[PDB]
Short mmCIF file of C-alpha atoms in Angstrom, two decimals:
data_model
loop_
_atom_site.label_atom_id
_atom_site.label_comp_id
_atom_site.label_asym_id
_atom_site.label_seq_id
_atom_site.Cartn_x
_atom_site.Cartn_y
_atom_site.Cartn_z
CA UNK A 1 20.77 24.11 15.12
CA UNK A 2 18.39 22.78 12.46
CA UNK A 3 20.33 22.73 9.19
CA UNK A 4 18.79 25.05 6.57
CA UNK A 5 17.14 22.93 3.88
CA UNK A 6 16.26 23.82 0.28
CA UNK A 7 14.51 21.37 -2.00
CA UNK A 8 13.81 21.71 -5.70
CA UNK A 9 10.63 20.03 -6.96
CA UNK A 10 10.96 19.90 -10.76
CA UNK A 11 7.45 18.35 -11.08
CA UNK A 12 6.65 17.06 -14.59
CA UNK A 13 9.31 19.12 -16.39
CA UNK A 14 12.67 18.57 -18.04
CA UNK A 15 14.54 17.15 -21.04
CA UNK A 16 17.99 15.60 -21.21
CA UNK A 17 19.26 18.94 -22.52
CA UNK A 18 17.49 21.22 -20.03
CA UNK A 19 18.40 18.97 -17.09
CA UNK A 20 22.07 18.81 -18.14
CA UNK A 21 22.15 22.62 -18.32
CA UNK A 22 20.42 22.96 -14.94
CA UNK A 23 22.71 20.50 -13.16
CA UNK A 24 25.79 22.09 -14.74
CA UNK A 25 24.90 25.52 -13.37
CA UNK A 26 24.34 23.91 -9.96
CA UNK A 27 27.76 22.22 -10.31
CA UNK A 28 29.54 25.50 -11.07
CA UNK A 29 27.75 27.73 -8.54
CA UNK A 30 28.97 28.97 -5.17
CA UNK A 31 26.53 27.30 -2.75
CA UNK A 32 26.23 28.10 0.95
CA UNK A 33 27.82 25.01 2.58
CA UNK A 34 25.35 25.32 5.48
CA UNK A 35 22.41 24.52 3.15
CA UNK A 36 21.25 20.94 2.68
CA UNK A 37 20.25 20.77 -1.00
CA UNK A 38 17.88 18.24 -2.60
CA UNK A 39 16.49 18.21 -6.16
CA UNK A 40 13.61 15.96 -7.30
CA UNK A 41 13.64 15.05 -11.05
CA UNK A 42 10.90 13.03 -12.76
CA UNK A 43 11.61 9.38 -11.97
CA UNK A 44 12.62 8.52 -15.55
CA UNK A 45 15.31 11.22 -15.31
CA UNK A 46 16.57 10.45 -11.79
CA UNK A 47 19.60 8.32 -12.84
CA UNK A 48 20.67 10.80 -15.55
CA UNK A 49 20.39 13.87 -13.31
CA UNK A 50 22.36 12.23 -10.50
CA UNK A 51 25.02 11.08 -12.96
CA UNK A 52 25.61 14.71 -14.01
CA UNK A 53 26.18 16.02 -10.47
CA UNK A 54 29.88 16.88 -10.09
CA UNK A 55 29.64 16.67 -6.29
CA UNK A 56 27.08 13.95 -5.49
CA UNK A 57 27.93 14.21 -1.78
CA UNK A 58 26.82 17.88 -1.74
CA UNK A 59 23.50 17.86 -3.65
CA UNK A 60 21.17 14.90 -3.15
CA UNK A 61 18.34 13.60 -5.30
CA UNK A 62 14.75 12.81 -4.43
CA UNK A 63 11.88 10.96 -6.05
CA UNK A 64 8.65 12.96 -6.35
CA UNK A 65 6.44 10.08 -5.05
CA UNK A 66 6.38 6.35 -4.40
CA UNK A 67 3.71 3.78 -3.71
CA UNK A 68 2.52 2.38 -0.35
CA UNK A 69 3.50 -1.28 -0.83
CA UNK A 70 6.47 -3.61 -1.45
CA UNK A 71 7.08 -4.65 -5.05
CA UNK A 72 4.07 -6.19 -6.77
CA UNK A 73 1.25 -5.84 -9.31
CA UNK A 74 0.90 -2.05 -9.44
CA UNK A 75 1.47 -1.05 -13.07
CA UNK A 76 2.83 2.48 -13.33
CA UNK A 77 4.13 2.78 -9.74
CA UNK A 78 7.62 3.10 -8.24
CA UNK A 79 8.32 1.52 -4.88
CA UNK A 80 10.37 2.62 -1.89
CA UNK A 81 12.34 -0.65 -2.24
CA UNK A 82 13.39 0.46 -5.72
CA UNK A 83 14.49 3.82 -4.39
CA UNK A 84 16.59 1.99 -1.81
CA UNK A 85 18.01 -0.34 -4.49
CA UNK A 86 19.04 2.70 -6.57
CA UNK A 87 20.44 4.50 -3.52
CA UNK A 88 18.04 7.45 -3.91
CA UNK A 89 18.08 9.05 -0.45
CA UNK A 90 14.94 11.22 -0.44
CA UNK A 91 11.27 11.14 -1.45
CA UNK A 92 8.52 13.79 -1.50
CA UNK A 93 5.21 12.44 -0.13
CA UNK A 94 1.76 14.01 0.14
CA UNK A 95 2.40 16.84 -2.32
CA UNK A 96 -0.71 18.96 -2.88
CA UNK A 97 -0.92 17.93 -6.56
CA UNK A 98 -1.14 14.24 -5.58
CA UNK A 99 -3.87 15.14 -3.09
CA UNK A 100 -5.92 17.36 -5.38
CA UNK A 101 -5.32 15.86 -8.82
CA UNK A 102 -4.79 12.20 -8.00
CA UNK A 103 -6.97 11.88 -4.91
CA UNK A 104 -4.32 10.75 -2.44
CA UNK A 105 -5.77 10.66 1.08
CA UNK A 106 -4.23 11.31 4.49
CA UNK A 107 -4.48 7.57 5.12
CA UNK A 108 -2.68 6.57 1.91
CA UNK A 109 0.00 9.20 2.58
CA UNK A 110 0.47 7.90 6.16
CA UNK A 111 1.20 4.43 4.79
CA UNK A 112 3.68 5.79 2.20
CA UNK A 113 5.57 7.73 4.89
CA UNK A 114 5.91 4.73 7.19
CA UNK A 115 6.99 2.35 4.42
CA UNK A 116 9.48 4.87 2.93
CA UNK A 117 11.07 5.48 6.34
CA UNK A 118 11.22 1.71 6.96
CA UNK A 119 13.16 1.39 3.67
CA UNK A 120 15.82 3.86 4.94
CA UNK A 121 14.57 6.82 2.90
CA UNK A 122 14.37 10.41 4.07
CA UNK A 123 10.93 11.98 3.57
CA UNK A 124 9.74 15.48 2.71
CA UNK A 125 6.14 15.31 3.98
CA UNK A 126 3.86 17.98 2.50
CA UNK A 127 0.85 19.61 4.22
CA UNK A 128 -1.18 22.74 3.57
CA UNK A 129 -4.65 24.33 3.62
CA UNK A 130 -6.74 25.39 0.62
CA UNK A 131 -7.80 28.95 -0.13
CA UNK A 132 -11.33 28.25 1.20
CA UNK A 133 -10.01 26.61 4.36
CA UNK A 134 -7.76 29.63 4.86
CA UNK A 135 -10.53 32.19 4.32
CA UNK A 136 -12.87 30.27 6.67
CA UNK A 137 -10.25 30.27 9.46
CA UNK A 138 -9.56 26.50 9.37
CA UNK A 139 -5.80 26.68 8.66
CA UNK A 140 -4.48 25.30 11.95
CA UNK A 141 -7.28 22.75 12.20
CA UNK A 142 -6.36 21.48 8.73
CA UNK A 143 -2.57 21.39 9.02
CA UNK A 144 -2.60 19.94 12.55
CA UNK A 145 -4.83 17.10 11.33
CA UNK A 146 -2.58 16.50 8.31
CA UNK A 147 0.57 16.14 10.45
CA UNK A 148 -1.22 13.93 12.96
CA UNK A 149 -2.45 11.64 10.17
CA UNK A 150 0.68 11.59 7.97
CA UNK A 151 3.43 11.22 10.59
CA UNK A 152 2.44 11.34 14.27
CA UNK A 153 0.12 8.29 14.07
CA UNK A 154 2.71 5.76 12.81
CA UNK A 155 6.18 7.30 13.16
CA UNK A 156 8.32 7.05 16.27
CA UNK A 157 11.67 8.26 14.89
CA UNK A 158 11.39 11.66 13.18
CA UNK A 159 15.13 11.90 12.43
CA UNK A 160 14.67 11.53 8.69
CA UNK A 161 11.50 13.63 8.28
CA UNK A 162 11.24 17.17 6.94
CA UNK A 163 7.86 18.91 7.09
CA UNK A 164 6.91 21.07 4.05
CA UNK A 165 4.14 23.60 4.71
CA UNK A 166 2.77 24.64 1.28
CA UNK A 167 -0.57 26.46 1.42
CA UNK A 168 -2.41 25.28 -1.69
CA UNK A 169 -3.32 28.89 -2.58
CA UNK A 170 0.40 29.78 -2.87
CA UNK A 171 1.44 26.87 -5.18
CA UNK A 172 2.13 28.09 -8.72
CA UNK A 173 -0.21 31.06 -8.25
CA UNK A 174 2.25 33.91 -7.91
CA UNK A 175 0.79 34.54 -4.43
CA UNK A 176 3.50 33.84 -1.79
CA UNK A 177 2.69 33.75 1.91
CA UNK A 178 3.94 36.82 3.73
CA UNK A 179 6.75 36.18 6.24
CA UNK A 180 4.25 36.85 9.03
CA UNK A 181 1.71 34.43 7.55
CA UNK A 182 4.29 31.68 7.13
CA UNK A 183 5.99 32.23 10.50
CA UNK A 184 2.61 32.08 12.22
CA UNK A 185 1.90 28.61 10.80
CA UNK A 186 5.43 27.27 11.33
CA UNK A 187 5.46 28.41 14.97
CA UNK A 188 2.05 26.83 15.58
CA UNK A 189 3.25 23.62 13.91
CA UNK A 190 6.36 23.47 16.10
CA UNK A 191 4.19 24.04 19.20
CA UNK A 192 1.92 21.21 18.07
CA UNK A 193 4.99 18.97 17.75
CA UNK A 194 6.33 20.07 21.15
CA UNK A 195 3.06 19.28 22.96
CA UNK A 196 1.88 16.24 20.97
CA UNK A 197 5.12 14.43 20.11
CA UNK A 198 8.08 15.70 22.15
CA UNK A 199 10.17 18.86 22.62
CA UNK A 200 13.17 17.04 21.12
CA UNK A 201 11.24 16.36 17.90
CA UNK A 202 9.96 19.95 17.83
CA UNK A 203 13.47 21.35 18.30
CA UNK A 204 15.12 19.18 15.61
CA UNK A 205 12.48 18.79 12.86
CA UNK A 206 12.96 21.13 9.91
CA UNK A 207 9.75 22.87 8.82
CA UNK A 208 10.21 24.36 5.34
CA UNK A 209 7.90 26.71 3.43
CA UNK A 210 6.69 26.22 -0.13
CA UNK A 211 4.45 28.09 -2.54
CA UNK A 212 5.76 30.72 -5.00
CA UNK A 213 9.19 31.02 -3.33
CA UNK A 214 11.59 32.89 -5.59
CA UNK A 215 14.87 34.77 -5.40
CA UNK A 216 13.18 38.09 -4.56
CA UNK A 217 11.04 36.87 -1.62
CA UNK A 218 13.23 34.15 -0.08
CA UNK A 219 15.51 36.38 2.03
CA UNK A 220 12.72 37.86 4.17
CA UNK A 221 11.14 34.41 4.59
CA UNK A 222 14.42 32.83 5.70
CA UNK A 223 14.81 35.37 8.52
CA UNK A 224 11.74 33.94 10.26
CA UNK A 225 12.82 31.92 13.34
CA UNK A 226 10.68 28.85 12.63
CA UNK A 227 11.14 28.68 8.83
CA UNK A 228 13.95 26.18 8.17
CA UNK A 229 14.15 26.49 4.38
CA UNK A 230 12.03 26.00 1.28
CA UNK A 231 10.40 23.62 -1.14
CA UNK A 232 10.75 25.34 -4.50
CA UNK A 233 8.63 24.47 -7.56
CA UNK A 234 8.73 26.88 -10.52
CA UNK A 235 11.92 28.71 -9.48
CA UNK A 236 13.80 25.41 -9.15
CA UNK A 237 13.73 25.06 -12.96
CA UNK A 238 15.59 28.40 -13.25
CA UNK A 239 19.06 27.42 -12.04
CA UNK A 240 20.38 30.92 -11.11
CA UNK A 241 17.24 31.61 -9.14
CA UNK A 242 17.49 28.24 -7.37
CA UNK A 243 21.09 29.12 -6.44
CA UNK A 244 19.93 32.40 -4.87
CA UNK A 245 17.32 30.54 -2.83
CA UNK A 246 19.97 28.02 -1.65
CA UNK A 247 21.88 31.17 -0.58
CA UNK A 248 18.85 32.84 1.07
CA UNK A 249 20.70 33.29 4.40
CA UNK A 250 23.87 34.70 2.86
CA UNK B 1 -7.10 -10.87 -42.41
CA UNK B 2 -3.56 -12.12 -41.69
CA UNK B 3 -0.79 -9.55 -42.25
CA UNK B 4 -0.69 -8.71 -38.50
CA UNK B 5 2.75 -9.30 -36.99
CA UNK B 6 2.81 -11.41 -33.81
CA UNK B 7 3.31 -9.13 -30.79
CA UNK B 8 4.59 -10.05 -27.30
CA UNK B 9 4.84 -7.44 -24.54
CA UNK B 10 6.24 -7.94 -21.07
CA UNK B 11 4.75 -5.74 -18.30
CA UNK B 12 7.09 -5.96 -15.31
CA UNK B 13 4.70 -3.86 -13.14
CA UNK B 14 6.27 -2.59 -9.90
CA UNK B 15 9.08 -5.15 -9.82
CA UNK B 16 12.80 -5.18 -10.37
CA UNK B 17 16.27 -4.33 -9.07
CA UNK B 18 19.48 -3.44 -10.88
CA UNK B 19 20.59 -7.04 -10.30
CA UNK B 20 17.34 -8.74 -11.33
CA UNK B 21 16.80 -6.58 -14.45
CA UNK B 22 20.42 -7.09 -15.58
CA UNK B 23 19.87 -10.86 -15.38
CA UNK B 24 16.53 -10.84 -17.21
CA UNK B 25 17.80 -8.66 -20.07
CA UNK B 26 21.02 -10.66 -20.44
CA UNK B 27 18.94 -13.82 -20.84
CA UNK B 28 16.81 -12.17 -23.54
CA UNK B 29 20.01 -10.95 -25.22
CA UNK B 30 21.34 -14.54 -25.21
CA UNK B 31 18.16 -16.28 -26.33
CA UNK B 32 17.16 -17.41 -29.79
CA UNK B 33 13.98 -15.41 -30.49
CA UNK B 34 11.57 -15.97 -33.37
CA UNK B 35 12.22 -13.01 -35.73
CA UNK B 36 8.49 -12.90 -36.64
CA UNK B 37 7.68 -11.64 -33.12
CA UNK B 38 7.56 -7.96 -32.17
CA UNK B 39 8.92 -7.85 -28.60
CA UNK B 40 8.36 -5.01 -26.10
CA UNK B 41 9.27 -4.90 -22.41
CA UNK B 42 7.96 -2.31 -19.92
CA UNK B 43 10.26 -1.65 -16.91
CA UNK B 44 9.31 0.67 -14.04
CA UNK B 45 10.02 4.21 -15.20
CA UNK B 46 13.06 4.69 -12.95
CA UNK B 47 14.77 1.60 -14.53
CA UNK B 48 13.79 2.45 -18.12
CA UNK B 49 17.22 4.01 -19.04
CA UNK B 50 19.15 1.18 -17.40
CA UNK B 51 17.10 -1.56 -19.05
CA UNK B 52 17.45 0.00 -22.48
CA UNK B 53 21.20 0.41 -21.98
CA UNK B 54 21.58 -3.34 -21.45
CA UNK B 55 19.49 -4.30 -24.51
CA UNK B 56 21.93 -5.55 -27.17
CA UNK B 57 19.57 -5.93 -30.12
CA UNK B 58 17.86 -2.58 -29.41
CA UNK B 59 16.08 -3.00 -32.74
CA UNK B 60 14.86 -6.53 -31.86
CA UNK B 61 13.42 -5.79 -28.38
CA UNK B 62 11.91 -2.40 -27.56
CA UNK B 63 11.06 -0.67 -24.28
CA UNK B 64 7.77 0.77 -23.04
CA UNK B 65 6.58 2.99 -20.23
CA UNK B 66 3.84 1.50 -18.02
CA UNK B 67 1.88 4.82 -17.92
CA UNK B 68 2.13 8.53 -18.69
CA UNK B 69 0.03 11.59 -17.91
CA UNK B 70 -2.60 13.34 -20.09
CA UNK B 71 -0.87 16.70 -20.54
CA UNK B 72 2.27 18.44 -21.78
CA UNK B 73 4.92 19.18 -19.16
CA UNK B 74 3.68 21.11 -16.14
CA UNK B 75 2.91 21.09 -12.43
CA UNK B 76 2.02 17.42 -11.96
CA UNK B 77 4.31 16.15 -9.19
CA UNK B 78 4.98 12.43 -9.56
CA UNK B 79 3.93 12.14 -13.24
CA UNK B 80 5.82 11.34 -16.47
CA UNK B 81 4.75 12.99 -19.73
CA UNK B 82 4.54 11.62 -23.24
CA UNK B 83 7.00 14.28 -24.37
CA UNK B 84 9.57 12.91 -21.91
CA UNK B 85 9.12 9.47 -23.41
CA UNK B 86 9.76 11.08 -26.81
CA UNK B 87 12.81 12.96 -25.50
CA UNK B 88 14.33 9.78 -24.09
CA UNK B 89 13.54 7.68 -27.16
CA UNK B 90 11.03 5.30 -25.52
CA UNK B 91 8.88 4.00 -28.39
CA UNK B 92 5.95 2.43 -26.49
CA UNK B 93 3.59 3.16 -23.59
CA UNK B 94 0.98 0.99 -21.88
CA UNK B 95 -2.26 2.92 -21.25
CA UNK B 96 -5.43 2.07 -19.39
CA UNK B 97 -4.04 -0.99 -17.58
CA UNK B 98 -6.66 -2.58 -15.31
CA UNK B 99 -4.60 -1.80 -12.20
CA UNK B 100 -4.63 1.92 -13.09
CA UNK B 101 -8.40 1.74 -13.60
CA UNK B 102 -9.25 -0.20 -10.43
CA UNK B 103 -6.55 0.86 -7.95
CA UNK B 104 -5.88 4.41 -9.15
CA UNK B 105 -9.35 5.34 -10.44
CA UNK B 106 -8.29 6.15 -14.02
CA UNK B 107 -11.43 6.68 -16.10
CA UNK B 108 -12.38 5.96 -19.70
CA UNK B 109 -12.22 9.72 -20.33
CA UNK B 110 -8.76 10.15 -18.81
CA UNK B 111 -7.39 7.15 -20.72
CA UNK B 112 -8.77 8.47 -24.03
CA UNK B 113 -6.95 11.76 -23.51
CA UNK B 114 -3.74 9.88 -22.64
CA UNK B 115 -4.05 7.77 -25.80
CA UNK B 116 -4.52 10.79 -28.07
CA UNK B 117 -1.69 12.78 -26.52
CA UNK B 118 0.69 9.79 -26.61
CA UNK B 119 -0.06 9.17 -30.30
CA UNK B 120 0.31 12.90 -31.00
CA UNK B 121 3.83 12.65 -29.52
CA UNK B 122 4.82 9.82 -31.90
CA UNK B 123 4.51 7.05 -29.31
CA UNK B 124 3.08 3.62 -29.95
CA UNK B 125 0.30 2.65 -27.52
CA UNK B 126 -0.73 -0.64 -25.95
CA UNK B 127 -4.32 0.27 -25.01
CA UNK B 128 -5.75 -2.07 -22.37
CA UNK B 129 -9.40 -3.10 -21.96
CA UNK B 130 -11.13 -5.86 -20.03
CA UNK B 131 -14.31 -6.77 -18.12
CA UNK B 132 -14.55 -7.74 -14.46
CA UNK B 133 -15.68 -11.10 -13.15
CA UNK B 134 -19.01 -9.53 -12.11
CA UNK B 135 -19.48 -7.95 -15.55
CA UNK B 136 -18.94 -11.31 -17.27
CA UNK B 137 -21.38 -13.20 -15.04
CA UNK B 138 -23.92 -10.42 -15.61
CA UNK B 139 -23.40 -11.17 -19.33
CA UNK B 140 -21.97 -7.71 -20.08
CA UNK B 141 -18.50 -8.66 -21.41
CA UNK B 142 -18.98 -7.34 -24.94
CA UNK B 143 -20.99 -4.31 -23.77
CA UNK B 144 -18.09 -3.35 -21.49
CA UNK B 145 -15.16 -3.93 -23.85
CA UNK B 146 -16.98 -2.21 -26.75
CA UNK B 147 -17.68 0.88 -24.64
CA UNK B 148 -14.08 0.85 -23.36
CA UNK B 149 -12.71 0.71 -26.90
CA UNK B 150 -15.21 3.34 -28.11
CA UNK B 151 -14.20 5.90 -25.49
CA UNK B 152 -10.46 5.08 -25.25
CA UNK B 153 -9.56 5.24 -28.96
CA UNK B 154 -12.47 5.31 -31.40
CA UNK B 155 -13.49 8.82 -30.23
CA UNK B 156 -10.40 11.00 -30.32
CA UNK B 157 -8.26 8.84 -32.66
CA UNK B 158 -8.32 8.67 -36.45
CA UNK B 159 -5.01 6.95 -37.24
CA UNK B 160 -4.90 3.49 -35.61
CA UNK B 161 -1.55 2.58 -37.23
CA UNK B 162 0.36 2.73 -33.93
CA UNK B 163 -2.32 1.24 -31.62
CA UNK B 164 -2.19 -2.29 -30.19
CA UNK B 165 -5.35 -3.32 -28.30
CA UNK B 166 -4.74 -5.53 -25.25
CA UNK B 167 -7.72 -7.53 -23.99
CA UNK B 168 -7.04 -8.57 -20.38
CA UNK B 169 -10.13 -9.79 -18.51
CA UNK B 170 -9.71 -8.61 -14.92
CA UNK B 171 -10.48 -12.08 -13.53
CA UNK B 172 -7.44 -13.46 -15.41
CA UNK B 173 -4.85 -10.89 -14.27
CA UNK B 174 -2.55 -12.39 -11.65
CA UNK B 175 -5.12 -15.02 -10.64
CA UNK B 176 -3.80 -18.10 -12.41
CA UNK B 177 -7.17 -18.35 -14.21
CA UNK B 178 -6.15 -17.98 -17.87
CA UNK B 179 -8.90 -17.57 -20.43
CA UNK B 180 -9.39 -20.67 -22.55
CA UNK B 181 -8.41 -20.42 -26.24
CA UNK B 182 -12.16 -20.44 -26.99
CA UNK B 183 -12.96 -17.76 -24.41
CA UNK B 184 -10.25 -15.40 -25.68
CA UNK B 185 -10.92 -15.98 -29.38
CA UNK B 186 -14.62 -15.21 -28.90
CA UNK B 187 -13.93 -11.74 -27.48
CA UNK B 188 -11.10 -10.97 -29.92
CA UNK B 189 -13.25 -11.88 -32.94
CA UNK B 190 -16.13 -9.80 -31.56
CA UNK B 191 -13.78 -6.84 -30.94
CA UNK B 192 -12.43 -7.14 -34.50
CA UNK B 193 -16.02 -7.12 -35.81
CA UNK B 194 -16.71 -4.01 -33.72
CA UNK B 195 -13.73 -2.29 -35.37
CA UNK B 196 -14.95 -3.39 -38.82
CA UNK B 197 -18.43 -1.94 -38.32
CA UNK B 198 -17.58 1.13 -36.24
CA UNK B 199 -14.23 2.27 -37.69
CA UNK B 200 -13.24 0.58 -40.96
CA UNK B 201 -12.49 -2.88 -42.41
CA UNK B 202 -8.91 -1.67 -42.93
CA UNK B 203 -8.48 -0.85 -39.24
CA UNK B 204 -10.08 -4.15 -38.19
CA UNK B 205 -7.83 -6.18 -40.50
CA UNK B 206 -4.57 -4.46 -39.50
CA UNK B 207 -4.94 -3.73 -35.74
CA UNK B 208 -3.28 -6.28 -33.42
CA UNK B 209 -5.52 -7.48 -30.59
CA UNK B 210 -3.42 -9.23 -27.95
CA UNK B 211 -4.57 -11.33 -25.02
CA UNK B 212 -3.42 -10.79 -21.44
CA UNK B 213 -4.09 -12.50 -18.13
CA UNK B 214 -2.05 -15.44 -16.72
CA UNK B 215 -0.27 -16.18 -20.03
CA UNK B 216 2.59 -18.64 -19.51
CA UNK B 217 4.90 -20.97 -21.44
CA UNK B 218 2.44 -23.87 -21.10
CA UNK B 219 -0.75 -22.13 -22.27
CA UNK B 220 0.62 -19.74 -24.90
CA UNK B 221 0.88 -22.11 -27.88
CA UNK B 222 -2.82 -23.02 -27.87
CA UNK B 223 -3.82 -19.37 -27.52
CA UNK B 224 -1.44 -18.21 -30.26
CA UNK B 225 -3.17 -20.57 -32.73
CA UNK B 226 -6.48 -18.71 -32.46
CA UNK B 227 -7.20 -16.65 -35.61
CA UNK B 228 -7.97 -13.30 -33.94
CA UNK B 229 -5.33 -13.42 -31.16
CA UNK B 230 -2.26 -11.50 -32.38
CA UNK B 231 -0.06 -12.03 -29.32
CA UNK B 232 0.18 -11.45 -25.59
CA UNK B 233 0.64 -8.90 -22.83
CA UNK B 234 2.47 -10.90 -20.16
CA UNK B 235 2.67 -9.93 -16.50
CA UNK B 236 3.99 -12.38 -13.92
CA UNK B 237 5.55 -14.64 -16.52
CA UNK B 238 7.57 -11.75 -18.01
CA UNK B 239 9.80 -11.60 -14.92
CA UNK B 240 10.88 -15.22 -15.66
CA UNK B 241 13.20 -14.78 -18.64
CA UNK B 242 13.08 -18.45 -19.85
CA UNK B 243 9.27 -18.53 -19.83
CA UNK B 244 9.07 -15.12 -21.53
CA UNK B 245 11.40 -16.55 -24.22
CA UNK B 246 8.99 -19.43 -24.82
CA UNK B 247 6.03 -17.04 -25.11
CA UNK B 248 7.95 -14.96 -27.65
CA UNK B 249 8.38 -18.27 -29.52
CA UNK B 250 4.75 -19.42 -29.07
CA UNK B 251 4.27 -19.64 -32.86
CA UNK B 252 7.38 -21.78 -33.37
#
């Protein structure tokens, strides 16, 4: 009875005109009411995008990142307090691009997750192995360590956590995980949760898949028993395709 | 020379709420501000539209981003691009701030690419340089700031018309240890000489070099008198609207 969850990570993309058009198509579409829908604009566009949503109770917005600390002398950063002040309900943390391009560590990500949750936010926490880790057979070693470090160390209440498994080799590459590849990891992640946290947390925590999800591969992925939805990058910028992914179980 | 317009920027860093930013802008809207001062304020990116919406004299006070990325739009989760700043009508961006260099590892090379791309997108750039306490006591102040300016702008940039150089010694940022008028003027004059010899006399004479690091209402008038200090980049004191008003009026 985990609610199906589909997130749209717009990354560093959008203009006032393209975002208006995207949100308007979302507004007018038939969306599966059993899908929890979150879209993550660039921070400078978060107030505009939310203002255009015709049904703000039905599609929520997310920041793509925030810093570890309360407000202070960190030029260029956005804080979790600010998200709370603006009533932004969600935040993506530990995305592969922050890890690989901006050097964010498991330890820094752990502190962001704890502070965001303490500010009342809901967190999409991202994990995933590289191509070389995958080829060398280290996938479960890597993703088990990432979850332990990012959430299980500091977090007691998992109610407001969603886990996003996004193998780095599937992000933006055109190379999606097969349903069997993704189900294998999700099932092993849920077993890790069951044995290392609690069966209640394993039963209720959504584990969503990301990495080249699109309208033509989402239906077979969504049939997998431990895949609870998707984190969508490129296809989230194409409104009709994002609608189909929201409707992956229909 | 002396045709450089006095420039005051307020860097709010990672601070602000809807309530607190409303208040601070309303005070600036109310205040009597010296019309010879170019005024720029830099809210956190997520409050940039709100802050600009509350600015009454949108011609008299302008808004800035505190950072942007090196590249055109793409797969850089958590980043803002220069073309978004252009789309939204943000005229200014701060680049190379010490906190980005020291806390977030931003390098001379990265900052130079940011500066070029921002200028290519029609933005105006506050380009920040400054030496550490250790670098100054090792006697390397001018070696550091000259290298930082050479990589960050002098390399990839040919038009300096829309560049403001901000000298903010690291040991003065947030510490309460403002540079003396003598200390600041010495670096600014040496930077302006560097520009004269390594770029052009025209660029040296026209480029504003502003001082940053613990500027406040009480120390700004003596600094603003120095010949090669063209204004201030103000951190902590920019969240205090009355004090920021006085700094804007430091030449009155």
